[PDB]
RNA sequence: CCUUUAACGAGGAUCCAUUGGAGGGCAAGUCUGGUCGCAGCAGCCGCGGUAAUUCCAGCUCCAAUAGCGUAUAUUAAAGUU
RNA sequence: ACCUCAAACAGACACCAUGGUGCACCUGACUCCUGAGGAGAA
C-alpha cells in the first residue's frame, strides 16, 4: 500500500521495479558480470592448476587444529588459489609440481567451517580420485 | 478384591444435571453459551473416542542469584473424529505432572467445528464452510475450502488439529514467524473457532429462543444445591 | 596472578615433576627470539635454522611462555618457515639438559 | 604424550588396528528386501506398551 | 539386434547390488576396540583437552535402488522485489 | 507587659585506574497385583 493504483500507471510501476531490483545483492552480481572478472573461475564448475607448495593453515577459535592445505596456480589465468585437501593422509598422495583438479566447497562464494581464507578444495590428482587413492582400490600410476 | 469407583461428585450446578442425566448432549450446553467448569462432564459424554497428541515439550527457565530454575511447558491436543477438538498449555516443575495438567485443561476448552461443502452436495461435509482466518501475535492462517480427496495441505503443526477435527480437505497458507509454534497452533485453533461465529445465509432465519435447562430443571436444585 | 577468584573451577595442578623426552624426528629444542601477540610467536631453533613457532592446543592459556628460554618444537612435515610448538620445559630442566651435553652449549638464561 | 610432531598426517589411521568379519551370507535385493521389511515391522505382530525401542538396539 | 525355435544352462559357498547415512535439522546405535583439542569430521548448529551416541575401524540398523553421491548455473520455497 | 494574625525553606562535589583462561540439554506418557488360599497346619 501507499503507492499508485492508477489505470495508466504502467510506466511508473515498471520503471520503479527495474530500479529497486538493483538494491538486491544477488541480482547485482549476476547482471554486472563483476563476478566473472573478479573470480579465479570463469563460472566453470571446476578448474585445473599446478601445485606450488603445501602449507599448514590454522583454525578459527574455539577449534584448534592444523588443516594442511595446498596452494596452487592455475593453467588458464596464472593466478593463485588456496585449496583444502580432504581426509587423513590424502596430503601425501598429492606431490609438489603436479597437476590437480579443484572445485568449490558447496557454499558458492564464502569460506566454510572454521577454516578461513579457503574457498576451494581438491578432487582429482591425475585422472584418479582421492577416494580410490585413500581406500586402496587404485594405486599411484607412477 | 475391593471394587467400585465413586469418582466425580459434582460441586457445580451444570455437573449435577449431567450426573442425574437430564441433559442429554453437549449441544444443548453450547447453544446457551455456558462455561464448563469440570473436566468430567465432557468425559461422561465422550471418553471412548478422545485421543491426545502431545505436540512439544518445551523448557523455559528464569535466572536467580543461585542460578537457573527450569520448568517444563507442554502443549497437548485433543479431539475425536466427529467435530470436537481442543488444545491446552500448562507448565510445572516436572514433566508428567505438566502433561497430565494439560490433558485436563484441553478437555475443558473443547469446542465444536462447523464443516461444509465445496460447491455442490452429495452428503457428509468434508471441508470448511467459508474462508476464514485466525491470528495470534503476528502469526495467522488462511483456511481456504478445497474439493474432495485433495487431503489436508498444510504444515505438520495444523495438520494434527484439522485431521482430528474431521476437516479432511483444506488449503492453507501461513504468514509470519511460524517457528515459535505456540503462536502457530493457537492461531490455527483461533481459526477453527470462528466457523460457528461466521454468519452465512443459511442462518438468516430467526431463532425460536427455547427456554434454558437452568430454568426447566431448577426443581431438583431446590434442596440445598448450588 | 595475585590471588583473585574463579581460578579454582578447574584443575589445580601443578607439575608433580617429571620428565623427559627430547628431540624426536622433526621434534626438537628451540629458543624464544621474540614475543608477538594475537597468539603465535617467534623462536629460533638451536641447530642454526630460524623458523616461526606456533602455539598448541591446551598450552594456550594453561601455560605462559615468557620471552627468552628453551622450548620443545615439532617441525611441520612439509613446511619450512612455520613450525609447531609442543612441550616446553622448565629453566632448571633446560640447564640440566645443557649440563648433560645434548643440546648445543650456546644460549644463556 | 605426542612425540614426532603433531603436524604429522596419517596419524590416527596408521596406528589403528584393521580387522574384519566379512559376510558369507547373501542378502536379498529388489522384491524380497521389501517383503522382509513389511513382515518384520508390521505383520509379526509383536508391539506392546509405550516404549522407545527403535528398530535398532545394540544397547 | 529384436521376436521365433533345437541342444546345453540355478541348491545359494555361487549364474554374487551398489551408493550414502545413523547427535539435532531428517528416516536409523547414550553398542565394542583405537585416538585424546592431536589426527579428522562438520552445508548449518557443533563434535575431539584419556568414560567421543558425531573422528578412525568392527558389528548392527536406516534411506533410495540399476542407480546413488559431489561441484556449478537456474527455478520453486521467497508476500526476503 | 502578660494581652487579640496562625505558612515552608539545614545548602555546595581532591584523588579513585586495570583484572592469565577451557563450565553448565546428553530431560517422554499404563503401570499396582509386594500380598492374600497364606502362617501354624502343609
From Swiss-Prot, chain A:
Kindly give the Pfam families that the UniProt entry links to this protein.
Ribosom_S12_S23 (PF00164)
Q: Which Gene3D superfamilies match?
A: Nucleic acid-binding proteins
Point out residues bearing the modification 3-hydroxyproline.
62
Q: Which GO terms describe its biological process?
A: translation
Instruction: Give the compositionally biased regions (Basic residues).
Output: 1-20
Name of this protein: Small ribosomal subunit protein uS12
Where is the cross-link described as Glycyl lysine isopeptide (Lys-Gly) (interchain with G-Cter in SUMO2)? Answer: 37
GO MF terms held by the record: structural constituent of ribosome
Q: Which species expresses this protein natively? A: Oryctolagus cuniculus
Residue numbers carrying N6-succinyllysine: 54
Name the encoding gene, please. RPS23
What is the recorded post-translational modification?
Hydroxylation at Pro-62 affects translation termination efficiency.
From Swiss-Prot, chain D:
Coiled-coil features, chain-numbered ranges: none
Location in the cell reads: Cytoplasm; Nucleus
Q: Which residues carry this modification: N6-succinyllysine?
A: 51
**Organism domain of life:** Eukaryota
Q: Subunit info? A: Component of the 40S subunit of the ribosome.
Q: What does this protein do?
A: Component of the 40S subunit of the ribosome. Contributes to the assembly and function of 40S ribosomal subunits.
UniProt protein name: Small ribosomal subunit protein eS30
Lineage runs:
Eukaryota, Metazoa, Chordata, Craniata, Vertebrata
Amino acid at each position: 500500500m501507499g503507492k499508485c493504483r492508477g489505470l495508466r500507471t504502467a510506466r511508473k510501476l515498471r520503471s520503479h521495479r527495474r530500479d529497486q531490483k538493483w538494491h538486491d545483492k544477488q541480482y547485482k552480481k549476476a547482471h554486472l558480470g563483476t563476478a566473472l572478472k573478479a573470480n579465479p573461475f570463469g563460472g566453470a564448475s571446476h578448474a585445473k592448476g599446478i601445485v606450488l607448495e603445501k602449507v599448514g593453515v590454522e583454525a578459527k577459535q574455539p577449534n584448534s587444529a592444523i588443516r594442511k592445505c595446498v596452494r596452487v596456480q592455475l593453467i588458464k589465468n596464472g593466478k593463485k588459489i588456496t585449496a583444502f585437501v580432504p581426509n587423513d593422509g590424502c596430503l601425501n598422495f598429492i606431490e609438489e609440481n603436479d597437476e590437480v583438479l579443484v572445485a568449490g566447497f558447496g557454499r558458492k562464494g564464502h569460506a566454510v567451517g572454521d577454516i578461513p581464507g579457503v574457498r576451494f578444495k581438491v578432487v582429482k590428482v591425475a585422472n584418479v580420485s582421492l577416494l580410490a587413492l585413500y581406500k586402496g582400490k587404485k594405486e599411484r600410476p607412477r | 478384591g475391593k471394587a467400585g469407583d465413586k469418582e466425580w461428585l459434582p460441586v457445580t450446578k451444570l455437573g449435577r444435571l449431567v450426573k442425574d442425566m437430564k441433559i442429554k448432549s453437549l449441544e444443548e450446553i453450547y447453544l446457551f453459551s455456558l462455561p464448563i467448569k469440570e473436566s468430567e462432564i465432557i468425559d461422561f459424554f465422550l471418553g471412548a473416542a478422545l485421543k491426545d497428541k502431545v505436540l512439544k515439550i518445551m523448557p523455559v527457565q528464569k535466572q536467580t542469584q543461585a542460578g537457573q530454575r527450569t520448568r517444563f511447558k507442554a502443549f497437548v491436543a485433543i479431539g475425536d473424529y466427529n467435530g470436537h477438538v481442543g488444545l491446552g498449555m500448562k507448565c510445572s516443575k516436572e514433566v508428567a505432572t505438566a502433561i497430565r495438567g494439560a490433558i485436563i485443561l484441553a478437555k475443558l476448552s473443547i469446542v465444536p467445528v462447523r464443516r461444509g461443502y465445496w460447491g455442490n452436495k452429495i452428503g457428509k461435509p468434508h471441508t470448511v464452510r467459508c474462508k476464514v482466518t485466525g491470528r495470534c501475535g503476528s502469526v495467522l492462517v488462511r483456511l481456504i475450502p478445497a474439493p474432495r480427496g485433495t487431503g489436508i495441505i498444510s504444515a505438520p503443526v495444523p495438520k494434527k488439529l484439522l485431521l482430528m477435527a474431521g476437516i479432511d480437505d483444506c488449503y492453507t497458507s501461513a504468514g509470519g514467524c511460524t517457528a515459535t509454534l505456540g503462536n502457530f497452533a493457537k492461531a490455527t485453533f483461533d481459526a477453527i473457532s470462528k466457523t460457528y461465529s461466521y454468519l452465512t445465509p443459511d442462518l438468516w432465519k430467526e431463532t425460536v429462543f427455547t427456554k434454558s435447562p437452568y430454568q426447566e430443571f431448577t426443581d431438583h436444585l431446590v434442596k440445598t444445591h448450588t | 596472578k595475585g590471588g583473585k577468584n574463579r581460578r579454582r573451577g578447574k584443575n589445580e595442578n601443578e607439575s608433580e615433576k617429571r620428565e623427559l623426552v627430547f628431540k624426536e624426528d622433526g621434534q626438537e629444542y628451540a629458543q624464544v627470539i621474540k614475543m608477538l601477540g594475537n597468539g603465535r610467536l617467534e623462536a629460533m631453533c638451536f641447530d642454526g635454522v630460524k623458523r616461526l613457532c606456533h602455539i598448541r592446543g591446551k598450552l594456550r592459556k594453561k601455560v605462559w611462555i615468557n620471552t627468552s628460554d628453551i622450548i620443545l618444537v615439532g617441525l611441520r612435515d612439509y613446511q619450512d618457515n612455520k613450525a609447531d610448538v609442543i612441550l616446553k620445559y622448565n629453566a632448571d630442566e633446560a640447564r640440566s639438559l645443557k649440563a648433560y651435553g645434548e643440546l648445543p652449549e650456546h644460549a644463556k638464561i | 604424550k605426542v612425540h614426532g610432531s603433531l603436524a604429522r598426517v596419517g596419524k590416527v589411521r596408521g596406528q589403528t588396528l584393521k580387522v574384519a568379519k566379512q559376510e558369507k551370507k547373501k542378502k536379498r535385493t529388489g522384491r524380497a528386501k521389501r517383503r522382509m521389511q513389511y513382515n518384520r515391522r508390521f505383520v509379526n505382530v509383536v508391539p506392546t506398551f509405550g516404549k522407545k525401542k527403535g528398530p535398532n538396539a545394540n544397547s
